[PDB]
Amino acid sequence: CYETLWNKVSGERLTWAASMESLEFYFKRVPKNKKKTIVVLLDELDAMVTKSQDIMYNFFNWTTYENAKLIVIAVANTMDLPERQLGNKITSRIGFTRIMFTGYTHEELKNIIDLRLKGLNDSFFYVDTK
Amino acid sequence: GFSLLFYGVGSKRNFLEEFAIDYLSPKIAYSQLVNSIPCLILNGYNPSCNYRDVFKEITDLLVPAELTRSETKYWGNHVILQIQKMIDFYKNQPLDIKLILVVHNLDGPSIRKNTFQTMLSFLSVIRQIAIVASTDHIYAPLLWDNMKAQNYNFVFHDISNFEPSTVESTFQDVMKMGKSDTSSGAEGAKYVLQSLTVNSKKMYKLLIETQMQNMGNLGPKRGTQRTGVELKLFNHLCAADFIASNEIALRSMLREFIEHKMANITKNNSGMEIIWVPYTYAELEKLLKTVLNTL
Amino acid sequence: FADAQRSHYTVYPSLPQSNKNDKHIPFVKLLSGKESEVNVEKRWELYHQLHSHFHDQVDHIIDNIEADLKAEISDLLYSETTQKRRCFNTIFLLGSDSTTKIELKDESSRYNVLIELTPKESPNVRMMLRRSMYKLYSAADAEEHNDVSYDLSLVENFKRLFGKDLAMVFNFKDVDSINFNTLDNFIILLKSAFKYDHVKISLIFNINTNLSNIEKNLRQSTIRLLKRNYHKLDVSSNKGFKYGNQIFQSFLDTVDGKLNLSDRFVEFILSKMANNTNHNLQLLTKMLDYSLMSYFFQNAFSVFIDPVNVDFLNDDYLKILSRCPTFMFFEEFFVEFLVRENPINGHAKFVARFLEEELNITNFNLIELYHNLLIGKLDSYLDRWSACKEYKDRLHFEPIDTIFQELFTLDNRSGLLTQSIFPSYKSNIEDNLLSWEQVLPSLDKENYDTLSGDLDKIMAPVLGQLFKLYREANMTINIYDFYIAFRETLPKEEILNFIRKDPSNTKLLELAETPDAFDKVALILFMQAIFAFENMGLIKFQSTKSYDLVEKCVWRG
DNA sequence: ACAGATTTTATGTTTAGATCTTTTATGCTTG
DNA sequence: CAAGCATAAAAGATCTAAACATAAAATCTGT
């Protein structure tokens, strides 16, 4: 996931270590005058951390730098993934907005289904028996 | 060509060191002829003594020839094969000693295992090095077979002076009489870290705490590589705490810990550097709460 | 840092710039440092020349042994076997140390590949096979100057690959150590390589104990397969007694009549030789060399071995030698009874040669014969064969008639020889520990100057004092009662007085006023001593969750 | 400055060493 | 004494980290 980001922000192809150092140097030393903001959607962060505990730290630390203009939108299943994985001190020294999603109620799911069939419910169709 | 052994009650560490460093080396240097003969002294009472590092020192000092690809054999141990090649090479060199390998407490915790004993057995056949050793255990001669006794070619000598062995008891606890975690080696780490440096203690505390966090994320287990801390992660954490500014200072001050086996640095399968402490989680917590936590 | 806390740290000492011409010599001036330096130098050079003379012959004998065994095994390997190519010939080397370079003869049409396998390099069958095939491929390619997978099919394709026949010889270095399940499976696997009619296999088993263990462990079918061609070959340094005799004769000639062997010394040689068979010749060489170097070291008269320096006798030499018991019982007087060479060595060599040429007796120990001749019961050793009855008339030997042999002899009367090569390790430890009086010297000249001139004499060292009670203790010992007894054996007021004797320290005197200061310093000493015992293995501890009991491991004597 | 020499990332392959878990060889213990 | 009861240690499942190993792409070195 490192090199992909680099390959999507730099057009070059680098290995994972070189991508790590390149992204860190681009998020740390390049002045804000000559950079364009990046929005990263770290979908399924659960699979990224595993034994490494490296991806998540790098991505939640690259947003701490003032030079870096990065809006990391991480998404996961377990609400307590950061505080467990990084530790209370690190998850406190990094201020990130936490959002929790609750499963839809019956009314909400009925509304979703009804909205997805607004154009077909109680409709007239011409059908040929042939 | 007689490797020499000292056995008896009391600590022979001071006596044997006095013999080898002050008397043996200058005298053999004078007789060979200038510089004194190097003296590799090997502390066997330390449970952190490793045979890989000992042979690394011996090959850094003596500098033997490398072994050819054919001589490597199919996955065979490189240390023993290199030693046998050294024996073959040294069977023709002039018979003048180029190193004395002092072995304190030859029957200690991490020095009595068969691998390092086999290494020393093959190493002592080399006439150009002198193997002076000391033993303490009563059943110490149980460690040597017929072949190992032949290769050692010992000449036992009795030294008994009832010395109190202050240095030997340092590496293990005495309040619990040493009955528990005798070969852990954490007590020596506590002793060496008690008064080392404030910044080194602080960064060691950071590393220990990160390792405990990783263990919790992952029963008392050893601190293996899978749970250790990444070098880049550690540098970032230290920079966030104004401990080590850059790579150079951190590596320079960490080499001291690496050489004393309080920590180890390896490379993961993906190539990421990892630094870890090989102590048990309970031992790590005790070390944190007894010396680290007092600041 | 603390260097004592390190491990395997090299140290380069700073040698002093002060030096002399020839002060650098291990030999020291004997007779209270009265002998001249020229005598010491002459002793050093004669020792070196004699050591070289002995070890040259020892090396020649060793090389002869290696060459003879290699030639014999190579001859037995081929032996012009007419057996059909349906089984592999096996050679069981009975009691062979795994130190030999089995040479395979070069054949124009057949590669001869020696594949050596060891228990460390054979965890299981697949690794046995992979290592064997790698060695085969490497040796074949080196001889012959794409890749092939490491499996038995490399043997199948060998004739096609290299256009030559194959002969693989498997040398199992330590066949006793390998778990015989994997060895049996590997042999059964090798059995599958007989469908090719261009490959011949030869197995060599370096057995150490006997064939009884091989029969017991190996499967019956494998033994049946091996039995088709096996050759029990007994190769060993201790078999036949024909090699220890050569080394002993070499030593006897390198001392000639210049030196004499004491009866008790050769008895000790025989006793220590009888207690070891796997490695015998090397132990004998070590014992002889150590005795020789010790004799040249702690004997002052070794400088006078050759006649040329007999005139170099001084007043101190004659004064010391005047107390010789042989002289009491009995320059120019000494030489006329010194240059007389001992005929014992020549007679022994003649007897050995006479019996080994035409008397058709070979199984005899020249060391045993020499010891018996030294005692003087040569008939009791020559009558066992019951064949030299008509030759005993000319084999009679005139009894021992020699004088001044105390000064030129090889013996162990001070016990250094037995306590430096085969010491009573545990017994020595217990003898030193029980009677500490003879280990730590007792001094009273400077007891006034020392700070503890009244406490050193009264009491005993802590570790030995604890060992006294430990020996007088029971099999299982409660720690509390042991400490109670140790403290009761400890004097009370003297410890406190010793504590008060130091005014420099302040924490010690602060703790001194505490009423149980003695009761806790004694406890500290007890923990130190019990830790030292645990380190030395004298005592052991039971389940650490209880830790209230200990067991004695080693008993005295 | 162009091909060789060295390095960097990226596995595969055996050996040496670890802890968990299950079973069962040790003690503790009345007559 | 055996059963009961307890803890303990052997035998092995399950696994990892290290030593030993090869290889293709990109970097660093001399003419």
Swiss-Prot record, chain A:
Mg(2+) binds at residues 43-44. ATP binds at residues 44, 77. It is found in: Nucleus. Belongs to the ORC1 family. The N-terminus is dedicated to mating-type repression. Component of the origin recognition complex (ORC) composed of at least ORC1, ORC2, ORC3, ORC4, ORC5 and ORC6. Interacts with MCM10 and TAH11. Component of the origin recognition complex (ORC) that binds origins of replication. It has a role in both chromosomal replication and mating type transcriptional silencing. Binds to the ARS consensus sequence (ACS) of origins of replication. Present with 3930 molecules/cell in log phase SD medium. This is Origin recognition complex subunit 1. The gene is ORC1. The chain holds residues 524 to 653 of 914 of the full protein.
UniProtKB/Swiss-Prot annotation, chain B:
Belongs to the ORC2 family. It is found in: Nucleus. It comes from Saccharomyces cerevisiae (strain ATCC 204508 / S288c). Coiled coil: none annotated. Present with 1700 molecules/cell in log phase SD medium. Component of the origin recognition complex (ORC) composed of at least ORC1, ORC2, ORC3, ORC4, ORC5 and ORC6. Interacts with MCM10 and TAH11. The gene is ORC2. The chain holds residues 311 to 620 of 620 of the full protein. This is Origin recognition complex subunit 2. Component of the origin recognition complex (ORC) that binds origins of replication. It has a role in both chromosomal replication and mating type transcriptional silencing. Binds to the ARS consensus sequence (ACS) of origins of replication. The lineage of its organism: Eukaryota, Fungi, Dikarya, Ascomycota, Saccharomycotina.
Curated annotation (Swiss-Prot), chain C:
GO terms for cellular component: DNA replication preinitiation complex; nuclear origin of replication recognition complex; nuclear pre-replicative complex; nucleoplasm; nucleus. InterPro entries: EF_Hand_1_Ca_BS (IPR018247), ORC3 (IPR020795), ORC3_N (IPR045667), ORC_WH_C (IPR040855). One of its GO terms (molecular function) is DNA replication origin binding. It is found in: Nucleus. GO terms for biological process: DNA replication initiation; pre-replicative complex assembly involved in nuclear cell cycle DNA replication; silent mating-type cassette heterochromatin formation. Keywords: Acetylation, DNA replication, DNA-binding, Nucleus. Component of the origin recognition complex (ORC) that binds origins of replication. It has a role in both chromosomal replication and mating type transcriptional silencing. Binds to the ARS consensus sequence (ACS) of origins of replication. Component of the origin recognition complex (ORC) composed of at least ORC1, ORC2, ORC3, ORC4, ORC5 and ORC6. Interacts with ORC6. Belongs to the ORC3 family. This is Origin recognition complex subunit 3. It comes from Saccharomyces cerevisiae (strain ATCC 204508 / S288c). The gene is ORC3.
